[PDB]
Amino acid sequence: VGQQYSSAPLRTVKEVQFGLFSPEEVRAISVAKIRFPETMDETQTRAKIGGLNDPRLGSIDRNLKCQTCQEGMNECPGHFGHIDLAKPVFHVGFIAKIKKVCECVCMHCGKLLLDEHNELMRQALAIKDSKKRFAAIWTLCKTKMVCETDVPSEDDPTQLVSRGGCGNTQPTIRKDGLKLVGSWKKDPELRVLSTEEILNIFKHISVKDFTSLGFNEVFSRPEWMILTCLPVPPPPVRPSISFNESQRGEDDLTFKLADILKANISLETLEHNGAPHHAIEEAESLLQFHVATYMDNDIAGQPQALQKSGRPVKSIRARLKGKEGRIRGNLMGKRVDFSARTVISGDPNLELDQVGVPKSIAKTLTYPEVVTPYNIDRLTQLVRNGPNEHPGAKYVIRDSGDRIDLRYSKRAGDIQLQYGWKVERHIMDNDPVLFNRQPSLHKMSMMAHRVKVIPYSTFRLNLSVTSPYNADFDGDEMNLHVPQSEETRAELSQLCAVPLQIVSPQSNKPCMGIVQDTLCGIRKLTLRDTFIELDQVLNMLYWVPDWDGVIPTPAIIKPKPLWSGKQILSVAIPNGIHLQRFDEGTTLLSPKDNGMLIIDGQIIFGVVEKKTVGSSNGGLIHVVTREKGPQVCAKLFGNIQKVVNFWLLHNGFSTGIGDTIA
Amino acid sequence: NQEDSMIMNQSSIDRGLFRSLFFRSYMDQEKKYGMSITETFEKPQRTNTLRMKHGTYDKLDDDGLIAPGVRVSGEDVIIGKTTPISPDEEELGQRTAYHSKRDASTPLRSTENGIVDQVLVTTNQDGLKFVKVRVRTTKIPQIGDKFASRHGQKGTIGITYRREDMPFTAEGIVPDLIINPHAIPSRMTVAHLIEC
Amino acid sequence: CPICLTKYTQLEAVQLLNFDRTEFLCSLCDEPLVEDDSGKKNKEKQDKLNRLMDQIQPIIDS
Amino acid sequence: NENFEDFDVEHFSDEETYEEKPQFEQIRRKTLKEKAIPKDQRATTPYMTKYERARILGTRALQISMNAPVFVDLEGETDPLRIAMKELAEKKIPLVIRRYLPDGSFEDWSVEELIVDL
Amino acid sequence: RLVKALEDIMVHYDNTTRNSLGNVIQFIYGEDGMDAAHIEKQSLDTIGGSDAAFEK
Amino acid sequence: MFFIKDLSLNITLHPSFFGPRMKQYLKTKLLEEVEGSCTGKFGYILCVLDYDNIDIQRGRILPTDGSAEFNVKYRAVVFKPFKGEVVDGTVVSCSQHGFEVQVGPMKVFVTKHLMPQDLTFNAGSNPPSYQSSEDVITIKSRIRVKIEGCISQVSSIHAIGSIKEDYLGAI
Amino acid sequence: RGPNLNIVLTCPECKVYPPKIVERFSEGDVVCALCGLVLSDKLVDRVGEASNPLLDGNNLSTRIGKGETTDMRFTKELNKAQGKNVMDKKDNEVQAAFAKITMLCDAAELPKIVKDCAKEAYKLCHDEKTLKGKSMESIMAASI
Amino acid sequence: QNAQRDAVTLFCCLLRSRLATRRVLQEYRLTKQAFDWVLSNIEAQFLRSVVHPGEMVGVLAAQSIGEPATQMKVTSGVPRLKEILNVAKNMKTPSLTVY
Amino acid sequence: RRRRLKKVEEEENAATLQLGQEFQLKQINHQGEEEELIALNLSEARLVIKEALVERRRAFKRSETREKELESIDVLLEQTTGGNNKDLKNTMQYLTNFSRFRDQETVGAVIQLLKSTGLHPFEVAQLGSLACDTADEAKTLIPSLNNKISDDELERILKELSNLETL
Amino acid sequence: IFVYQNNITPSAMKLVPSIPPATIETFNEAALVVNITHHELVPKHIRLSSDEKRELLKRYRLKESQLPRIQRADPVALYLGLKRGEVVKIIRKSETSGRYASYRICM
Amino acid sequence: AGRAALYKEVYNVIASDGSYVNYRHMALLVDVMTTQGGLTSVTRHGFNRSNTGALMRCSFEETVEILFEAGASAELDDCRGVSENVILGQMAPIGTGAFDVMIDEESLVKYM
Amino acid sequence: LRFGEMERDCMIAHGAASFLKERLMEASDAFRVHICGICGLMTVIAKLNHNQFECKGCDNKIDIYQIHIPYAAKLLFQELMAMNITPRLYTDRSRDF
Ligand SMILES: [Mg+2]
Ligand SMILES: [Zn+2]
Ligand SMILES: [Zn+2]
Ligand SMILES: [Zn+2]
Ligand SMILES: [Zn+2]
Ligand SMILES: [Zn+2]
């Protein structure tokens, strides 16, 4: 059914601007204030208002609408909530940056310790990129342990000029877990710097000051690095799974948000009802730890938040990183529809650009063909055939976007197709499909073939195409992919087609060649002793599909009409092809029959071997695909394979234990 | 038979060459979550059970279990189980007061089929009734089935030929299997030849 | 809206009125909106204002 | 599950190896009319590229599959890709290609004037 | 690693080889502007041989 | 308020309209989605001026849909309301909540709290109206109203009116 | 009372209530059995922890434990912070009583269903005005 | 234009090595129309050999280097390739070749 | 160009000359140059729309009392505008009923009268639209006129517009 | 150009930056025994003028940051006395096109 | 000269086992490795630190740390890279995407 | 079936950009989401039946666009917002190439 029509303009994302939420923006975009750690109500059957699964945040049930946008599961993107923290906390991924900014700026008035009055500071401000400039400023100002309310003049060090400083001694700041401790210089007294103090000092940092530190005035202020209003992700981010559709197991993020809410309520009650400063610090440390492990559970030197079963809580950072994260496992690569996988098998009777697709796979995979006057009759016949018969169709998509399954519709009568409708019909012969073998190291390991629907359960493919795929038939499996639009179908067959990838750009030589039985039989066929009698010659000539119908004059007329193997293999070679290769000891007479001479597509001398029809530069494949084109070279592959495989079928080739005996 | 493929004789396959039995056992237990939330092995009906699977339930008996010997096909229910729900809800449109239960039945695998070989009813350690249903089928060798010698010479069936299409000796003996010569020299599997 | 417990301003009430031009219908419940009391107690707030100020009169004089 | 000794490499799984080794302007501005390079001084190739040919064939076949007017005499051909190739053969495709220079400027090349040598 | 370091390198319509930022890697691709598939090994006849064979 | 503006609209032409006379399909489709259309950014667009020459840019084919996106630039007359402006009109409907006055193509609702207290509702009279000691406000009656608030969505504009200020009401 | 927020899968063409609806799970569709029109596509068929909201209620808590690189000083302070919580004292004592239920049933080799039934019986009879002066061991024994 | 001449100077060296006046008149024995055909086909095959703009040559280069590595005194092979791609201050067999 | 949020702005108010960022005094036309914002009174807009409609009717062909005017504009709307013209019909009947001036001579006279006042384009069309009778009435109906025009000049403008008003 | 023997004291090295436009370059004698430019791996570096650099940026439609870089400690950069923002045309032998001319800006 | 030596070493590694790779691929590798004035390694601290877009850089390694340092520094991703358009699901400006296809009105009236 | 990272790389090497877009969008996850023009965040309440779009905070109803991104991309952006990062998506350029 797709998604409902929207009157908003359809645009593409041209720029992505990064930054940090203001605490004001979290409350501004929030649709609810989360106040209760519970998710279910007091009847354990509706969602609690103000809880973690508040209906204003969105719905993750197919039968429940969102309270805010009044849309279903597939349309509502989810809406954010917010938690007002009792005390501000550090962001766990910004602790080192907070510490560096703390070393940069004053801990008493919130001003940069070194200004343009210093020579080494001025060149640090002249650095264009923010990261290198901030690193230079931090390395220069980490050793300055005084605000320097009075500094020597730049023009001459004879008179003293007073900047806007307090002159206080900046403590050495070091981290011990989730908190920062400062030790003032002894005339060292160590004390823990509270997060509210750091937030207040970061609020006093001027616009020109943190811009020199690399912080944008609009998008990322240093004061926004301190968390005082925690955003609450919608239930689409943290769905409640079901083990047997009777348990209500929640996500790990829901558990962490419940713990954060419990710590926040505990801190609020301790502050409101009075508590010793040890208890307040302990509660705010617990809240800081819960927020940190909610954003990052794997912290060096910290305990890990654990589930009830003892497994570590999967934080958001764990959900993003790795090959199973959102980036690498869900965005850079992903599982896709309209794809198939089975064992591959060889087929010498297929073309180079053909894949033998199983009939069940063909009946499962579909292509949506738009109804035109050119295919109204064929698509009507495919709709009448139905989904249980190949060729047929499985769905009819109307112009309104409604999709009619062709199952549960024959009882409703026939469907009259209109122009512009789509028919999701089974993939038929000569449909361009992408065909791929993992690991897929190079581009020739994923190429476009044409479908030939076959009555067995394996993918069938030509033997010459196994070398670019690095594919065997000892149980190898290869993926199929079906394009779903005319653009992808067209650029699949005009860029990714198998004949177009015959010559590899990796080594400027062909990557597809005559291999295995065809190579052995093409060496045995083109020996001087190999003479073929008339009946077998006619059967060979008919096996070449583009044979022009003229029987070549035999190499021996009398006393018996005998054709040589070179003569019949030359029928597969197109006319106008000239090849000349001299091996060791090769002259115009070839006593060893080595080398190669092909004139006008006719083999003059030379046994045809890996140097001629293999994947080698200057071979027959390279010359034919450079002179005649890729389609003619694919036809050459097919013709050579057919004629040589027929000859080796009626000749035979073996190997045995006696071949290993000297 | 190129690139580790092998040509198997179809006539040999018809006489039982490499034909195998395949058994698959399905286990299911009725667990008591509490007082009213308990599972029951029963044959569900469309009138009073919600979220029924689209596969057939007609092969089940009164206990929700299929008798041994009955042929099963893909996505067919072999163990029938239902769990109670909260009455008078509003979900999926097709929810009424008659729907006091939902279906928690165990269907067969979507591609598998066969014959129910043995159905075993017993109790676990907790005393809850649980069942095991064994389904038996033939695996007849076809194109793509993997076969190996005793020497690391693995490969799938490229094609099957009948006896009259296979090569034959002067004694009328045809192979059950044709493997490629090119699997021999690079792998240096001399012991395959000496074994033959 | 007494059913969904949601507020609606006078600006967005007019965009939700029916074809009969008689009642304002809810966005979700499709129920006739009932009128709030923003302005009926406003003078009372002013009265509360008055009842604060004399009560805060010794503070400001100090 | 299963227990197989048939070694199947997990693909896109290099993070195992990653965890093994973790330790070691002047001529045009904004979007003015100077973005459009005039026809008399177009410096790009007059030949249609393989990507240009592929996307023109795809776009034309997509339009033909959605009842666009066909500008060539069909010989009984019904497949939209073959009709698009017939249109490209005798230069009856009413499209242009906006080739984007790396600085944001572009050149407009009509499909009719581009040489399809490939 | 090689793919991720080179995933944004493209030949542009000025035949310069540039990354996503537009930084020029090669001012012409392969220093000759040629597709690799259209390259064959050929013998340079002037560089080899003797001076007498060159004159002949 | 009536203005004349230069507006640019993105029109997605289906490939079925890729004929020799595609420009007149583009101009005809331009009128059908602009003439009388309401946009919250520019108000109620009424008529398209300068029809003889309309700036039609070169349309870009959408990379997955096949339709062509044109940026048609045109000069049109619009009616955009504002708060704090005085407009005349005629009443088209009346109720206990208030009466709707038709100004231009727009219906301004005058709430019951934003009238002088002498006016009261009378549903017994046909048609229902508001009766005061000096004037009556009935259907198809001239009335001058000051717009104090206008809400503009992406495709609709609703305005709130008052007649409490002096030199307003019936003319 | 309250917002509806209910989605019904009704065919807009057959107009039959209740509709014959087939959930084609393999094809990920919800279709009408009469006309074949799809109603909702891309349907949803692990990542969290199982928690039944009938035995321990709607309590969502995570404990603090040793990781790969963990200091002993930080763990003890967080454990004392978690222990010194006043709002979950009833939850703490009911989990202690449930632990005693499991300890007594496991010392008797009673089946798991007995443990579950005793736990839910204790939960249902907990915090009762008529049951306040009785000893904890008597409650324990009667629940078992 | 200078970049164009520098790009085609090696192919022009090859072309002058092949299409010299002595070699055409004595070895190849070409006629007027044959020579015109040779020149036209050399020009056409040259203009067909130019890399198409838009080609993702970086991924092509990365795959064309990585795949022969998958088919793979001083260190060589995969560890030497790793010590090259990781610009490492140390290496197993640092060496000179002094002439 | 900055991508800042800048989500805070004053509400569009006719009293304080705030008509929005897309109704500023200066407008960038399709040719790119700055040009004065065009505001029409109720009589001028009717003539502009009628001229546009008869121009469209002429282009299609080549390719007074209020009662006889209403049928003429009705048949013009039927023969010129296609579907979804209900808003345009309501606008045309609104401009016909609330028309202070009939012919283009009176409208041009009003324009040259108000072009020498030096006021905003928005407020002069409001002065030409509303049938004000008192200078204080014009000041309280249009709050932008306070400390902007003298009372005697405003009285002269109102009495001359009332003299130029017909039917 | 100051060609010292072993080392420069940091007390004298700090005043090596002097009044513009005077530039001071310090070279060690051991690093200048062998001319690096004569090495077969080192190709021909030619410093471009301001108008040549402007024409190079115009014809390729380039910015300063989009050029290949050479650092202002490179031995050829010190040999040529490159200041920041100076572009050298590097002519080198190419096995695919005989001659190839790259460009590098000094950073 | 460092680039030439790097090419020679890469060529020695490639042709050590007799495998042949065309010159332009290794040339592109050594030109990317030397385009910044020094030998930039193909590592997390090499090419991945160049300011080529945060969504591109997070795809390789240190995803969350790069996203954090982009959020703190307010990095503007111009979405010109392949990985940005892959993440955003729009057609990357590569291959067939390296241009725009626009309908020609002047040739449309010319055909008939 | 996994259309993994290096499958994407091989499709890049072919230059088949529209097929690469189709695999990642029309074959796995094509999600339409509205963003306002003021802030690039996805916090736009959209009633499609009533045709009403509104972003709270920005308080704009006339500056809304719809985009087609993967659902995994939407999930990424929402996780980044949960981690106090703004993935502000804008539909127009601000700086020259
Ligand atoms: Mg294998
Ligand atoms: Zn919602
Ligand atoms: Zn200070
Ligand atoms: Zn409601
Ligand atoms: Zn139906
Ligand atoms: Zn916003």
From Swiss-Prot, chain C:
Top-level taxonomic group: Eukaryota
Zinc finger (C4-type) in chain:
1-29
Location comes to: Nucleus
What family does the Swiss-Prot or TrEMBL record give for this protein? Answer: Belongs to the TFIIE alpha subunit family.
Q: What does this protein do?
A: Recruits TFIIH to the initiation complex and stimulates the RNA polymerase II C-terminal domain kinase and DNA-dependent ATPase activities of TFIIH. Both TFIIH and TFIIE are required for promoter clearance by RNA polymerase.
> Other comments?
Present with 35900 molecules/cell in log phase SD medium.
Q: How does it assemble?
A: TFIIE is a tetramer of two alpha (TFA1) and two beta (TFA2) subunits.
Name used for this protein in its record: Transcription initiation factor IIE subunit alpha
- Species whose genome carries this gene: Saccharomyces cerevisiae (strain ATCC 204508 / S288c)
Gene that this sequence comes from? TFA1
Write the span of the intact protein that is present. Answer: 124 to 185 of 482
Curated annotation (Swiss-Prot), chain D:
Q: Name one GO biological process term.
A: transcription initiation at RNA polymerase III promoter
Question: Where is the segment annotated Leucine-zipper?
Answer: 74-95
Q: InterPro entries attached here?
A: DNA-dir_RNA_polK_14-18kDa_CS, Pol_omega/Rpo6/RPB6, RPB6, RPB6/omega-like_sf, Rpo6/Rpb6
Question: Which superkingdom, per the lineage?
Answer: Eukaryota
Quote the cellular component terms of the Gene Ontology held in the record. cytoplasm; nucleoplasm; nucleus; RNA polymerase I complex; RNA polymerase II, core complex; RNA polymerase III complex
Locations of Basic and acidic residues compositional bias? 9-24
Keyword entries, A-Z: Cytoplasm, DNA-directed RNA polymerase, Nucleus, Phosphoprotein, Ribosome biogenesis, Transcription
Any one GO molecular-function label of the UniProt entry: DNA binding
* Major subcellular location class: cytoplasm
Q: Where in the cell is it found?
A: Cytoplasm; Nucleus
Positions carrying Phosphoserine: 13
- Other noteworthy facts: Present with 6090 molecules/cell in log phase SD medium.
Q: What does this protein do?
A: DNA-dependent RNA polymerases catalyze the transcription of DNA into RNA using the four ribonucleoside triphosphates as substrates. Common component of RNA polymerases I, II and III which synthesize ribosomal RNA precursors, mRNA precursors and many functional non-coding RNAs, and small RNAs, such as 5S rRNA and tRNAs, respectively. Pol II is the central component of the basal RNA polymerase II transcription machinery. RNA polymerases are composed of mobile elements that move relative to each other.
* PANTHER family in UniProt: DNA-DIRECTED RNA POLYMERASE SUBUNIT K, DNA-DIRECTED RNA POLYMERASES I, II, AND III SUBUNIT RPABC2
Q: Which NCBIfam families match?
A: PRK01099.1-3
Protein name listed in UniProt = DNA-directed RNA polymerases I, II, and III subunit RPABC2
Q: Which gene encodes it?
A: RPO26
Curated annotation (Swiss-Prot), chain H:
Q: Which family does it belong to?
A: Belongs to the RNA polymerase beta' chain family.
Q: What else is known?
A: Mutagenesis experiments demonstrate that the minimum viable CTD contains eight consensus Y-S-P-T-S-P-[A-S-N-G] heptapeptide repeats. Identical and simultaneous substitutions in a number of consecutive repeats are lethal: 'Ser-2' -> 'Ala-2' (14 repeats), 'Ser-5' -> 'Ala-5' (15 repeats), '2-Ser-Pro-Thr-Ser-5'-> '2-Ala-Pro-Thr-Ala-5' (10 repeats), 'Ser-2'-> 'Glu-2' (15 repeats), 'Ser-5' -> 'Glu-5' (12 repeats), '2-Ser-Pro-3' -> '2-Pro-Ser-3' (15 repeats) and 'Tyr-1' -> 'Phe-1' (12 repeats).
- What note about domains is in the entry? The C-terminal domain (CTD) serves as a platform for assembly of factors that regulate transcription initiation, elongation, termination and mRNA processing.
- What is the protein name stated in its UniProt record? DNA-directed RNA polymerase II subunit RPB1
Q: Where in the cell is it found?
A: Nucleus
What is the organism field in this record? Saccharomyces cerevisiae (strain ATCC 204508 / S288c) (Baker's yeast)
Gene encoding it?
A: RPO21
Residues of the whole record sequence present: 1008 to 1119 of 1733
| Subunit details | Component of the RNA polymerase II (Pol II) complex consisting of 12 subunits. Interacts with DEF1; the interaction is direct and serves to bridge RPB1 to the Elongin complex in a DNA-damaged dependent manner. Interacts with the Elongin subunit ELA1. Interacts with the Elongin subunit ELC1. Interacts with ASK10. Interacts with ESS1. Interacts with RTT103. Interacts with SHE2.
From Swiss-Prot, chain I:
What is the predominant subcellular site recorded for this chain? Answer: nucleus
* Stored InterPro entries: HRDC-like_sf, RNA_pol_Rpb4/RPC9_core, Rpb4-like, Rpb4/RPC9, Rpb4/RPC9_sf
The answer to whether UniProt assigns keyword Membrane to this entry is no
Which GO terms are recorded in the biological process aspect for this UniProt protein? DNA-templated transcription initiation; mRNA processing; nuclear-transcribed mRNA catabolic process, deadenylation-dependent decay; positive regulation of translational initiation; RNA-templated transcription; transcription by RNA polymerase II; transcription elongation by RNA polymerase II; transcription initiation at RNA polymerase II promoter
User: What is the purpose of this protein?
Assistant: DNA-dependent RNA polymerase catalyzes the transcription of DNA into RNA using the four ribonucleoside triphosphates as substrates. Component of RNA polymerase II which synthesizes mRNA precursors and many functional non-coding RNAs. Pol II is the central component of the basal RNA polymerase II transcription machinery. It is composed of mobile elements that move relative to each other. RPB4 is part of a subcomplex with RPB7 that binds to a pocket formed by RPB1, RPB2 and RPB6 at the base of the clamp element.
Q: Which family does it belong to?
A: Belongs to the eukaryotic RPB4 RNA polymerase subunit family.
What name does the UniProt record give this protein? DNA-directed RNA polymerase II subunit RPB4
Tell me what organism the protein belongs to.
Saccharomyces cerevisiae (strain ATCC 204508 / S288c) (Baker's yeast)
